[PDB]
Amino acid sequence: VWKAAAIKAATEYALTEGAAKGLAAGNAHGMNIVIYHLKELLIDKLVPNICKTVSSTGDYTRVINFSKLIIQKRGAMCGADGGTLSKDMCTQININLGTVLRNGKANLPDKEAVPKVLNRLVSQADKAANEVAKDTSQSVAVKITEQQTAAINATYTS
Amino acid sequence: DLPRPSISAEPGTVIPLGSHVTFVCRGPVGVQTFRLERESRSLYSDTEDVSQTSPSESEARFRIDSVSEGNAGPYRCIYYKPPKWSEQSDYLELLVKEA
């Protein structure tokens, strides 16, 4: 009447549930920080519909796509024409995009700079999301594995 | 290492209000991106649309359609040829006549 079969099935169901919860929790933390940095880097000012336009898609890796759009919007609002944002606005926006470099000099031509920094932002989210993903997956699995073997010991008593 | 750019204006440096203007950066060949700067920390335009004017120099152009009063003053320019940028060209002053 050996309980090995039930514990194998309890732990297998344990692993698959814990991987799932850890994925959902993982690449949902990872969008939380992408949405946090886009607001921090003033990109929100370049395109006002960006926090939702990226979140409503799931998959935070997809912000890479908005590169050409930011480049366009950056030149249109902080161009040589005189621009539509404040000069101090544009000073920081250029700094954050890594395009004009805090001490005054030129960093990168804007075509390299925008794709670079949000490739940096996705790589910085992947480590955090994989971190949350394996904490949550282990936390959930050992929690539901112990309750299930506790109930499987409780069941063989009767 | 890299030569200094040059900035000129077409038709010229004195433009009636409402007219148009085109700034013309020039540097060597093989240039990736030209950048026109008005207040270099904040306001600038960037273009990879570079055309070759001679065997040893290329150039790019930036155009303002309706010239405003706030368009007058400094402009200068600089180009990127990986891995480094150039130094910054001499200034150009755009003046804007009301009539």
Side-chain angles (χ1 to χ4, degrees), chain A residues 75 79-81, chain B residues 5-11 20-26 31-38 44-50 59-65 67 75-79 85 92 94:
Chain A
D81 38 36
Chain B
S6 293
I7 184 139
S8 39
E10 288 173 13
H20 78 80
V21 79
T22 323
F23 309 87
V24 176
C25 284
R26 175 237 306 188
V31 184
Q32 159 147 351
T33 285
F34 270 100
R35 171 175 301 190
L36 164 79
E37 309 159 296
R38 160 169 205 61
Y44 75 80
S45 294
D46 255 22
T47 195
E48 296 88 36
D49 172 336
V50 153
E59 95 179 24
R61 312 160 104 82
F62 312 79
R63 174 179 248 242
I64 299 164
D65 273 317
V67 182
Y75 296 86
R76 48 185 198 169
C77 91
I78 188 162
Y79 64 87
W85 287 85
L92 173 157
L94 161 69

Side-chain angles (χ1 to χ4, degrees), chain B residues 49-71:
Chain B
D49 172 336
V50 153
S51 98
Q52 170 118 342
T53 52
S54 94
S56 55
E57 92 172 9
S58 55
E59 95 179 24
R61 312 160 104 82
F62 312 79
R63 174 179 248 242
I64 299 164
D65 273 317
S66 83
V67 182
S68 95
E69 283 275 17
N71 286 130

Side-chain angles (χ1 to χ4, degrees), chain A residues 74-75 77-83 85-87 90-91 94 99-100 102-104 106-112, chain B residues 32-33 35-46 48 62 64 68 70-71 75 78 80 82-83 85 88:
Chain A
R74 169 273 161 279
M77 326 191 70
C78 302
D81 38 36
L85 301 190
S86 171
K87 281 150 231 62
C90 294
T91 299
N94 300 341
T99 189
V100 84
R102 64 297 173 295
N103 72 26
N107 194 21
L108 293 167
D110 183 316
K111 159 207 206 183
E112 271 67 359
Chain B
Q32 159 147 351
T33 285
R35 171 175 301 190
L36 164 79
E37 309 159 296
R38 160 169 205 61
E39 302 238 70
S40 148
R41 269 155 163 93
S42 40
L43 265 42
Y44 75 80
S45 294
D46 255 22
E48 296 88 36
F62 312 79
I64 299 164
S68 95
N71 286 130
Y75 296 86
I78 188 162
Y80 181 55
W85 287 85
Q88 281 220 354

Side-chain angles (χ1 to χ4, degrees), chain A residues 1-120:
Chain A
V1 292
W2 212 228
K3 333 152 47 186
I7 293 297
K8 80 85 187 155
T11 66
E12 189 220 290
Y13 166 86
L15 290 187
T16 79
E17 183 69 21
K21 276 228 163 169
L23 189 44
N27 63 29
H29 173 60
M31 181 148 316
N32 271 131
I33 87 169
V34 168
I35 302 295
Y36 168 70
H37 272 63
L38 303 183
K39 276 201 264 318
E40 158 179 285
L41 297 178
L42 295 325
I43 306 192
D44 43 311
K45 309 292 180 189
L46 267 39
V47 317
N49 311 148
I50 178 76
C51 291
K52 287 196 157 182
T53 318
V54 185
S55 83
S56 69
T57 77
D59 187 344
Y60 58 80
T61 79
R62 270 209 222 289
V63 61
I64 185 54
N65 290 343
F66 303 68
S67 210
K68 163 153 148 310
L69 178 290
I70 286 156
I71 301 195
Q72 158 173 14
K73 281 287 206 141
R74 169 273 161 279
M77 326 191 70
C78 302
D81 38 36
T84 326
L85 301 190
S86 171
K87 281 150 231 62
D88 295 310
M89 257 297 121
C90 294
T91 299
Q92 194 83 52
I93 283 155
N94 300 341
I95 273 182
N96 298 349
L97 302 178
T99 189
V100 84
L101 188 292
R102 64 297 173 295
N103 72 26
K105 323 275 160 236
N107 194 21
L108 293 167
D110 183 316
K111 159 207 206 183
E112 271 67 359
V114 168
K116 177 162 197 289
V117 317
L118 49 76
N119 273 329
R120 165 213 98 71

